[PDB]
Amino acid sequence: IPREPRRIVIHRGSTGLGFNIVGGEDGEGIFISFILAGGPADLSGELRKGDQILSVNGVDLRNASHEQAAIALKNAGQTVTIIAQYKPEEYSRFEANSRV
């Protein structure tokens, strides 16, 4: 998978973009934790578990809280342009950490 930032356009199904985010706490970034099978994210085939979301419709989320990121994603409209960067090592760092 490419590790540089990536531009991804998703067209929203009435239900949603079809993925989950964690992060946006204690200065941590916003990451994709789950991709809903059959959803827009899943069919675009571009987003992955472990992706950090750097911006949505040009709104910088590098320094965002969780709630700020959630509000941005939910309100980004029908055509959502995402800047994402694949960071498996960082995601793993958290996931391992969470297993305690």
């Binding site: 949603g16 973009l17 993925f19 989950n20 985010i21 964690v22 946006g24 706490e25 934790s33 789950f34 809903l36 969780h66 959630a70 994603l73 939910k74």
Partner: peptide, 6 residues
């Protein structure tokens, strides 16, 4: 702590 569906 938090996980949100979008």
């Amino acid at each position: 702590k938090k996980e949100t569906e979008v």
